[PDB]
Amino acid sequence: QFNPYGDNGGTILGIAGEDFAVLAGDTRNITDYSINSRYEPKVFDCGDNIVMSANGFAADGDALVKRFKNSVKWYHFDHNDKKLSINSAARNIQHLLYGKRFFPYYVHTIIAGLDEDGKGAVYSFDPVGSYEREQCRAGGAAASLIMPFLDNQVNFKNQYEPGTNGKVKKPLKYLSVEEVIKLVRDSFTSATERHIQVGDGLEILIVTKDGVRKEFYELKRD
Amino acid sequence: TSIMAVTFKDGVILGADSRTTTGAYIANRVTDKLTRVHDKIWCCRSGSAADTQAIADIVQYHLELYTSQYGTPSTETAASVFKELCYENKDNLTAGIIVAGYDDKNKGEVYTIPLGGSVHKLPYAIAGSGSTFIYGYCDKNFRENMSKEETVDFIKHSLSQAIKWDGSSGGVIRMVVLTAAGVERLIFYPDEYEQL
Amino acid sequence: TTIVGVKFNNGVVIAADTRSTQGPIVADKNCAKLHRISPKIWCAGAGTAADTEAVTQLIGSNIELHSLYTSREPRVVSALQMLKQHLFKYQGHIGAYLIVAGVDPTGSHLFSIHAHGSTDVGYYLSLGSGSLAAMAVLESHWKQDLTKEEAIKLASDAIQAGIWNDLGSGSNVDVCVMEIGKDAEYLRNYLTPNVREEKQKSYKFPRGTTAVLKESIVNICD
Amino acid sequence: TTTLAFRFQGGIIVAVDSRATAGNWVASQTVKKVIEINPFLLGTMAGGSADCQFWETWLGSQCRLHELREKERISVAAASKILSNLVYQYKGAGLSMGTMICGYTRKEGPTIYYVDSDGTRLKGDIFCVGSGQTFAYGVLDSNYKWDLSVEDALYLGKRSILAAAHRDAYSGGSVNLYHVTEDGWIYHGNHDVGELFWKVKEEEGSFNNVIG
Amino acid sequence: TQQPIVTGTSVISMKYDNGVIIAADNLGSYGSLLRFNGVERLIPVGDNTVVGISGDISDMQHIERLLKDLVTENAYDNPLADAEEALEPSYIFEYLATVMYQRRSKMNPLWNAIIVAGVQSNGDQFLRYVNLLGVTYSSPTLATGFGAHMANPLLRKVVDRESDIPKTTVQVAEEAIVNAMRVLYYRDARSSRNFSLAIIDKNTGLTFKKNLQVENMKWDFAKDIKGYGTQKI
Amino acid sequence: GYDRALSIFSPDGHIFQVEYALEAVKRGTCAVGVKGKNCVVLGCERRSTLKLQDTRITPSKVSKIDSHVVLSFSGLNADSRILIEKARVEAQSHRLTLEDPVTVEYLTRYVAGVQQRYTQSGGVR
Amino acid sequence: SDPSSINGGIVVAMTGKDCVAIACDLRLGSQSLGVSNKFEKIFHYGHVFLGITGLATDVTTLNEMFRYKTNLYKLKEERAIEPETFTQLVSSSLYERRFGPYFVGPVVAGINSKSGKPFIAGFDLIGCIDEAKDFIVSGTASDQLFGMCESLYEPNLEPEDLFETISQALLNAADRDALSGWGAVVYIIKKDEVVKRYLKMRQD
Amino acid sequence: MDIILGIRVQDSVILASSKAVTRGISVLKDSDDKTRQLSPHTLMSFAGEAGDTVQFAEYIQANIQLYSIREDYELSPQAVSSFVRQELAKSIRSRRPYQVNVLIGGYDKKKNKPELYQIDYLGTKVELPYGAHGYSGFYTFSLLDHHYRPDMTTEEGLDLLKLCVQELEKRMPMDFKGVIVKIVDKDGIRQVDDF
Amino acid sequence: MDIILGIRVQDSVILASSKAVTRGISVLKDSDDKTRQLSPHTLMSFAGEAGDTVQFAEYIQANIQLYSIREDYELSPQAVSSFVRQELAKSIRSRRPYQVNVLIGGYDKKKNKPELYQIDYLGTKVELPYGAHGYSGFYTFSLLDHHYRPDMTTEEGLDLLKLCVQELEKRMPMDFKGVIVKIVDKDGIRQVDDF
Ligand SMILES: *[C@@](C)(CO)[C@](*)(O)[C@H](CC(C)C)NC(=O)[C@H](Cc1ccccc1)NC(=O)[C@H](CC(C)C)NC(=O)[C@H](CCc1ccccc1)NC(=O)CN1CCOCC1
Ligand SMILES: *[C@@](C)(CO)[C@](*)(O)[C@H](CC(C)C)NC(=O)[C@H](Cc1ccccc1)NC(=O)[C@H](CC(C)C)NC(=O)[C@H](CCc1ccccc1)NC(=O)CN1CCOCC1
Ligand SMILES: *[C@@](C)(CO)[C@](*)(O)[C@H](CC(C)C)NC(=O)[C@H](Cc1ccccc1)NC(=O)[C@H](CC(C)C)NC(=O)[C@H](CCc1ccccc1)NC(=O)CN1CCOCC1
Ligand SMILES: [Cl-]
Ligand SMILES: [Mg+2]
Ligand SMILES: [Mg+2]
Ligand SMILES: [Mg+2]
Ligand SMILES: [Mg+2]
């Protein structure tokens, strides 16, 4: 019997700072035990300072990104070139996903950008459209490896102030773009070591008020 | 597999392709499907590689023990031992075997043993997935009391066609000649047989 | 796994990668897939990891007892016969896929065994998930009358093909050379082309970070 | 999930946890399971996160359209019935929702309606919904009286979620409290179970099963 | 919901400094039966694109008709049909990708794996894959079926990343492709000896080679192999 | 389906079909409504050119839409039945979804909306 | 009805400079229902420590079985069993039940008393040995533990520093797993002293 | 849902319906009224699939109330039962059938007689002196066969009904949290508050 | 079978076990004692598959009584629990396993301490301050987490137990016909007749 779904592997990661936000993703694309491409990007600039990635089944992922990119275009046409805010994009994406509630897009979606106060924003979606704003989210094949590391290093979970008898928690603070990129690179090298579907290359998209910058780093190719 | 054994004036010749597969992958392109159970009693193997190897090893053991006590066994006797194993373990075996041997009294003889474990003595036999495509050809072209060179050509042309149509058959064409003179191994490569 | 075996002038060489998987997770990054049956008979194993280890040790044990009983150096065909009859008896349930090689008084030998108990003979062989990548290289570069150094190069290149192209294989290349008239040389980590890069950050915590409820000295003595 | 809401002398208490799971994978510890429909209406979420989130926001749009058309805030009964009639149309399609529509109006007073995805709609004083509902019931029922003070009622709701968060593997994160009066709903904070459990253990002397 | 009947096996391809090469054998298999031997699975579109197709042959012939019709439709009311407004490889691919994904979404797929190879108007090499699921990806080397498992490893030794493309000539590239086709004939049970090869160069244009044969094969070592273990004769 | 736009604007900005429908109302028997401090009374004329009538069974001029709302009319008798039926159905539908009977304003707004729809729908008068 | 994830639990082990650490959570449940918060998964036979995750009945059974076997070993050998030897004993015993296996994920940890070398090892349910220089993980949050250990770990950590690393690896991994947590225990093991610490963690 | 009973006596029809609403391992409510008044002298109790029951009951209620307003007249219990049967008979061959079983108790004012109709989800109608749906019947029918007489009073019928509830409370596996009892007679419908 | 509870307090262990035996749609018995005295200071309650429960309980009882006669000595609750666990651990990999869950309440006379052990049919043993088997735990554990203190008296434990039974009688779907309560302390085993 024909199976309309497949698994293209890969993993993605979004972190938000004070005045910026990053959305990273590995460039490897796979089916079963074969590599299809060592460089196939899945993190996209969608306009209006919104970056997006839909990881899982690549055909559904490309379809969704394509439809959202198109949604941004028509939002301009219908509302006098108004900038689509990250919160409005998130709600729009929920309806795209839930529209296929009974034949879902098989993807974990993450978007990143700046909110209307200029502060960094990351939103994450399940396959059928539930969403939530967070400081931190990993998605895809190695999400279960990376996410607990992020809880510990970004949100300082389970870390207490030394000498305070485990009474005072380590205080929350925003991380610099330099510190965040260090965490992203370490997260992906660790994931590459222990997960077979992760590797080849890392592509990070950074979002500030000035625009969308890119950075690329090599990953292990085994 | 495509395998066959053909009796002729001076004795009998066994023939086989050299392809072993796992689905559509060729696990071995130079396989030897013609195997010795006794000096001048050989068999062609088709079906499961594991089953046919295990069976052939047991038969070789039985005939070696037979020879130690009662001297050289007949080809019929060898076929009976194959049958006994194939029949009694029919539920757990996937083995299509052709038994061929040379006596001096009985000359060349061919016995075929299909899946069920039945025995059939024939002038010539064909078996394996690729045999289906050459029933027509072999029936029209086989003659009794052929010469060595005619029988070699008959087998070569037959397996050439079987190989051409069957995806599960290919590689080289191995042959084993059983006569009073002795045992002769023959090999034929694609460049020769493909353009027949 | 990717494993290979290649015959040369005066003997035989086998090789293997060093990745052990647990679904999509890399359990062991540097495991040993080359096994010693007797001093000059070695085995490369793919498939169920416990089965390859257990079946190789059992036959290796019985081969040692046989060698002592007969006052003779063991033969590769004996190990081949004992392995195949054991595996056949278990109707494929013992998932051991082996490349058996070695030198003995009869000469040098190279065989493969499959889980259901079938054996093959060849000058070059490959087994495991990366066997197609390895066999592609072997079919491209193999020739008759290889030297020792040429066979090692060909074998390791065939493993590398698996390392880079098969997700089931990775990390390092182990080699074992069995030459006639000489001791077998086991080359553990013959190639190490997958070294982990320096991490961006030290994750050494300040002492006291973890909250503690109880301390107590444990008694290990009598 | 664990969610509850109960009616009492001083209005309605609504309490929920904040965990989201995908099998045994803890996906989030900070999910908002109470939906603010208007200043006088609340909705709780249990079951499929997308189903609940999508259709309860949709419910809020339908309630807004009612007050535009009728120049009057929608009743709790009518609001709950819009949702129950909606999910009934999808009956058999596989929606997964256990919700509670809580609010105050003049004609009704404080009112709670249980609504689920197989079309059940029930008016009542006490309900617990979710995988940890039984754990919440155990504490809530054994301590519930109609004459509870606002202060005690808030605590009992908080304590009942804590009980379920502790025992139910698929409940946890933090407790979100709400109090619904004649003047509308009032938010009573996010309470992390990480700190709340130990604070409650020490001060109350309960949870003696745990290593102190 | 379908099942494939008459099928075609691997399609392999790679980029080189000035263009792209693509190849596929001429077989139409009917299960294990090697039924049809005169089947062309490389279909040129214009003078700048070649579409290689594996999988179901009835669906391949349908796709042929679509591409044929696409050329006709593009020519309508188009004075620059053989110039600036000619069909690009990227246009042809995106059309097929759209169709493939729409058909999978209706639970009635075209049971194929497709590689579109060509050269764009600005000289850039184009090479992209699409299949029955609507999955798309691009790489310096691309292959379908058994080709993915056996050809890619060999072709990646020549062009391992982007920077290796300018360093790879058409002579070196074709040699690797022809070698890969030989390996597939050794090891793929649903392959044939006869195949077609196509080169699309930014300077010399489209070169379509028919009736090629696998040659320089190693079979001689087979004579030395006897039995399956202990046998000596 | 019959599609003709029967209700349309004229050069002076009048919809004659709607205005001629008012003439039909002017022809109908008189109906009056007076509301007191704690009640409403509906009075209706019945023409006396019809003797030998059976008043037991003859349709009454005032109709109950629900147990708490009533509707009287002036104009075409056959037309009124269609409006009354629709109103009665909407009354029960409101009780079913809102769990509360209609307000008099709501019921009126519905009946008025039905009448309006028939002024810019094709194929209807 | 998946035996390895009915009760839940995790175990992790690490090496340091002249020391080893092994840690485990305390939860025992029945699917969603948490039953016990005192269920320790680490045992020791002399100076050799064994952690076991998986089906709780088999955890108990195997502990009792290896206590049995190590006691007889000591009586006959007249010395304590070493980690390398004990590792082989565990592997043999699990593979004995090849076609009716114990549903467990054991982890060995200890220091060889003769050489002084730190030693850790892991196994699958049928006895395959997984040796490591750095760390071994096991249980329902093994994916999480792999991610934590691979990033947080560095070689040659002092006993006091190693404690912080392994504890943070376990705690944060446990908090992303529904069936793991409810308390934790860490064993720091030096050549001739062993410290056991109970960790404060979230109880949901 | 679960237990619904009905007894027709000399001058009235008595319906008893369980108060429990259970989902999973939790009794969500213990005061549920499993009935709807279709008209002043007609009452319908119901049991079956969650959601379907109330949706069906209220749909029938709306239709009967619509009829009453249109004709300024009350349909006979027999007429109402036939309408209900037909709706269920349609339903059973729909894409998704109503899984609802009902009892209809009414007092026919033209005949001056009480009437009890039992209708299952297939649309199987029967007029009976006493009726039950689900597993209840397996205890109550034999009990009523013994103790029931056709000329009983309303008080005698309530005592007969107490005897049924006692038997069910003794031998039924599930706790159904008692019953709400309602009487239908010449004066309409009223609820017994102390049972 | 269904509901079995256990509470360990300062000086005693209290076991409560439901009285109902149900088969199909009939409660066959409402006075069933789901327990066996293994020794003078050790009591075992049980629940699970019909037949298996009593067969297993009596088999354990016979073995412990045999031990007592042989050694003229009473096994400790810990020792008895370990024996029971091993028997169930054997059973789970048998051709037909015992589908029985048990609680073992005992008073250790050497330690002068009450002890409660919970063992499921797989052979999963835990010592607990309070325990339950089946769906009961889903209500009682959270309740006891709140109200339980380690230094409670036997009377305080019975009131705590009444609170559990009341909650179960309110929220459980099935009628389990109340409980038989037994106390295990320094003076042995006795039954509370009025609960
Ligand atoms: C022609 C090909 C067919 O008649 C010949 O008969 C040859 C005979 C020679 C080799 C003696 N037959 C085969 O090559 C034979 C085909 C076959 C396959 C399955 C059942 C019966 C016959 N191939 C084999 O026996 C291979 C040999 C290995 C690759 C060395 N074995 C398998 O393919 C095993 C067989 C398992 C089995 C099944 C039923 C009965 C007995 C044994 N199968 C697998 O390994 C399954 N494989 C796993 C990966 O996914 C693809 C399938
Ligand atoms: C390449 C990497 C893949 O083919 C090689 O072939 C290597 C062979 C080397 C290591 C000898 N193969 C593996 O690494 C092999 C892949 C595999 C997995 C499952 C079945 C067959 C092959 N991995 C293993 O064998 C691991 C060894 C671990 C990492 C030490 N074992 C497992 O993954 C076991 C499988 C056990 C098994 C039981 C019954 C039949 C077959 C296999 N699975 C688990 O541990 C999963 N699970 C964890 C939670 O607890 C319950 C078990
Ligand atoms: C308690 C906490 C648990 O029951 C509550 O009931 C909460 C309610 C809150 C969150 C509103 N329920 C859940 O957390 C709920 C449980 C559940 C899961 C699946 C079906 C029904 C109920 N969890 C979800 O809805 C999660 C929320 C995500 C993780 C943020 N979503 C999923 O599991 C999704 C979508 C499931 C789905 C439903 C209908 C059609 C298609 C899919 N599934 C995945 O993301 C799949 N999977 C996750 C792991 O990574 C690989 C992909
Ligand atoms: Cl063979
Ligand atoms: Mg990797
Ligand atoms: Mg062929
Ligand atoms: Mg919890
Ligand atoms: Mg946890």
How far apart (Å, rounded) are the C-alpha atoms in residues B176 and B161?
Answer: 19
Which H or E element spans position I168? helix I154-171
Q: CB–CB of G69/G75 below 8 Å?
A: no
Alpha-carbon distances, residue C174 vs B118, C20, C152, C185, H122 (angstroms) = 50, 14, 11, 11, 73
Instruction: Look up tokens 């999988």; give the residue.
Output: E55
Closest CA to E42 of E52, E28, E30, E32: E52
Looking from the CA of residue B129, the nearest atom of ligand 1 is 4
How far apart (Å, rounded) are the C-alpha atoms in residues H93 and H100?
Answer: 14
* Domains annotated on chain C, with CATH: 1-222 (3.60.20.10)
Q: Looking at the partner chain, which of D28, D30, D50 has a beta carbon nearest the beta carbon of A98?
A: D50
Instruction: Dump the DSSP string for chain E.
Output: -----EEE--EEEEEETTEEEEEEE--EEETTEEEES----EEEETTTEEEEEEEEHHHHHHHHHHHHHHHHHHHTT-TTTTTTTSPPHHHHHHHHHHHHHHHHHTT----EEEEEEEE-TTS-EEEEEEETT--EEE-SEEE-THHHHHHHHHHTTT--SGGGSTT--HHHHHHHHHHHHHHHHHHBTT--SEEEEEEEETTTEEEEEEEEE--S---GGGGG--SSSS---
CATH of the domain at E161: 3.60.20.10
| Tokens, residue C195 | 């070294």
The phi and psi torsions of I106 (rounded to 5 degrees) equal -150, 160
The domain in which residue D124 lies consists of 1-212
Catalytic residue among D1, D3, D105, D111: D1
Which H or E element spans position I35? strand I35-39
In angstroms, the first-to-last Cα distance of chain E is 52
The domain in which residue A5 lies consists of 1-222
Beta bridge partners of B110: B100, B122
3-state secondary structure of G186: strand
3-state secondary structure of F16: helix
| Tokens, residue E103 | 């058909």
- Helix ranges (H only) for B89-147 are 135-141
How far apart (Å, rounded) are the C-alpha atoms in residues C220 and G47?
Answer: 6
Name the superfamily (CATH) of residues G1-204.
Answer: Aminohydrolase, N-terminal nucleophile (Ntn) domain (3.60.20.10)
Number of domains present in the structure of chain E: 1
- Torsion of the alpha carbons at I94, I97, I100 and I104, rounded to the nearest 10: -10
Q: CB–CB of B74/B34 below 8 Å?
A: no
The phi and psi torsions of D84 (rounded to 5 degrees) equal -65, -40
How far apart (Å, rounded) are the C-alpha atoms in residues D70 and D72?
Answer: 5
Q: How far is D39 from chain G (nearest CA, A)?
A: 32
Closest CA to C79 of C68, C91, C67: C67
Q: Verify whether ligand 1 is closer than 6 Å to residue B45 (CB atom).
A: yes
How far apart (Å, rounded) are the C-alpha atoms in residues C80 and C98?
Answer: 10
Query: Which residue owns the Cα nearest ligand 3 atom 5?
Result: D1
Amino acid letter for position H136: S
Mutation for C interface: G99, G134, G149, G164, most C CBs within 10 A: G164
- Torsion of the alpha carbons at C185, C189, C191 and C192, rounded to the nearest 10: -170
Told to judge if D1 belongs to the known catalytic residues of this protein, a careful annotator would answer: yes
Q: CB–CB of G85/G151 below 8 Å?
A: no
Record the resolution, in angstroms: 2.6
Contact G32 D173 (CB under 8 A): no
Q: Verify whether ligand 1 is closer than 6 Å to residue C116 (CB atom).
A: yes
Does E109 reach chain A within 8 Å, measured CB to CB? Answer: yes
Q: Looking at the partner chain, which of G95, G194, G198 has a beta carbon nearest the beta carbon of C218?
A: G194
Q: Looking at the partner chain, which of F64, F93, F96 has a beta carbon nearest the beta carbon of H69?
A: F64
Contact D118 H51 (CB under 8 A): yes
Beta bridge partners of D96: none
Instruction: Dump the DSSP string for G92-118.
Output: HHHHTTTTS---EEEEEEEE-TTT--E
> Which chains form contacts with chain A, at 3 or more CB pairs under 8 Å?
C, D, E, G
Where does residue F37 rank: exposed (0-12), middle (13-18), buried (19+ CB within 10 A)?
A: exposed
Q: Which ligand is nearest to the CA of D197?
A: 7
How far apart (Å, rounded) are the C-alpha atoms in residues A93 and A124?
Answer: 10
Q: Verify whether ligand 1 is closer than 6 Å to residue B20 (CB atom).
A: yes
CATH of the domain at D171: 3.60.20.10
- Helix ranges (H only) for chain D are 49-70, 76-89, 133-143, 150-167, 193-204
How far apart (Å, rounded) are the C-alpha atoms in residues E32 and B167?
Answer: 5
Q: G204 alpha carbon to ligand 8 midpoint, in Å?
A: 6
Q: What chain H residue is nearest to I28 in terms of C-alpha separation? A: H171
Which H or E element spans position H83? helix H77-91
Q: How far is C92 from chain B (nearest CA, A)?
A: 10
Mutate to test the pocket of ligand 2, among G2, G90, G124 (most ligand atoms within 8 A of CB): G124
How far apart (Å, rounded) are the C-alpha atoms in residues I156 and B121?
Answer: 92
- Torsion of the alpha carbons at E112, E116, E117 and E121, rounded to the nearest 10: 170
Which sequence spans correspond to the domains of chain G? 1-204
Q: Which ligand is nearest to the CA of E186?
A: 6
Number of domains present in the structure of chain D: 1
> Which chains form contacts with chain F, at 3 or more CB pairs under 8 Å?
D, H
Q: CB–CB of B7/B143 below 8 Å?
A: no
Q: I79 alpha carbon to ligand 6 midpoint, in Å?
A: 71
The phi and psi torsions of E184 (rounded to 5 degrees) equal -65, -35
Instruction: Look up tokens 């002795």; give the residue.
Output: B182
The phi and psi torsions of G64 (rounded to 5 degrees) equal -60, -35
Residues 6 or more apart from H174 whose CB is under 8 A from it?
H2, H20, H22, I173, I174, I175
Closest CA to G139 of G15, G27, G1: G27
Q: Verify whether ligand 1 is closer than 6 Å to residue B27 (CB atom).
A: yes
Contact G35 I126 (CB under 8 A): yes
- Ligand 6 is an ion; its neighbours by CB within 5 Å are B 163, 170
3-state secondary structure of H10: coil
Closest CA to B18 of B134, B115, B159: B159
CATH of the domain at A182: 3.60.20.10
Residues 6 or more apart from G62 whose CB is under 8 A from it?
G52, G93, G102, G104, G106
Q: Verify whether ligand 3 is closer than 6 Å to residue A147 (CB atom).
A: no
Mutate to test the pocket of ligand 3, among D49, D95, D131, D170 (most ligand atoms within 8 A of CB): D49
The phi and psi torsions of C87 (rounded to 5 degrees) equal -65, -40
How far apart (Å, rounded) are the C-alpha atoms in residues D74 and F100?
Answer: 12
Q: What chain I residue is nearest to D144 in terms of C-alpha separation? A: I167
Method in brief: X-ray
> Which chains form contacts with chain H, at 3 or more CB pairs under 8 Å?
D, F, I
Residues 6 or more apart from C27 whose CB is under 8 A from it?
C20, C21, G122, G130
Contact I89 G61 (CB under 8 A): yes
- Helix ranges (H only) for F1-125 are 16-27, 77-98, 104-117
Q: What chain D residue is nearest to H29 in terms of C-alpha separation? A: D124
For CA atoms H149, H151, H153, H154, the dihedral sign is: positive
Is chain F touching chain E, with at least 3 CB–CB pairs below 8 Å? Answer: no
Mutation for B interface: C116, C125, C132, C142, most B CBs within 10 A: C116
* Inter-helix orientation angle G142-152/A143-153, to 10°: 50
B23 CB neighbours in chain E (<8 A) are 189
Q: What chain D residue is nearest to I163 in terms of C-alpha separation? A: D142
DSSP C88: H
Closest CA to G163 of G24, G10, G14, G11: G14
How far apart (Å, rounded) are the C-alpha atoms in residues E181 and D92?
Answer: 53
Q: CB–CB of D1/D46 below 8 Å?
A: yes
Q: How far is C3 from chain G (nearest CA, A)?
A: 19
> Which architecture, in CATH terms, is H1-195?
4-Layer Sandwich (3.60)
Query: How many residues in chain D?
Result: 212
How far apart (Å, rounded) are the C-alpha atoms in residues E143 and E10?
Answer: 7
Where does residue E131 rank: exposed (0-12), middle (13-18), buried (19+ CB within 10 A)?
A: buried
Beta bridge partners of G16: G19
Q: How far is C182 from chain G (nearest CA, A)?
A: 31
Q: Verify whether ligand 1 is closer than 6 Å to residue B46 (CB atom).
A: yes
B195 CB neighbours in chain E (<8 A) are none
3-state secondary structure of H40: coil
How far apart (Å, rounded) are the C-alpha atoms in residues I189 and I40?
Answer: 7
Contact H69 F93 (CB under 8 A): no
CA-only gyration radius of chain B, Å: 16
The domain in which residue E77 lies consists of 1-233
How many pairs of residues across B and E have Cβ atoms under 8 Å apart?
Answer: 71
Question: Taking the CB of residue I124, how many other CB atoms lie within 10 A of it?
Answer: 26
* Domains annotated on chain B, with CATH: 1-196 (3.60.20.10)
Mutate to test the pocket of ligand 3, among D16, D18, D21, D128 (most ligand atoms within 8 A of CB): D21
Which sequence spans correspond to the domains of chain I? 1-195
How far apart (Å, rounded) are the C-alpha atoms in residues H36 and H55?
Answer: 11
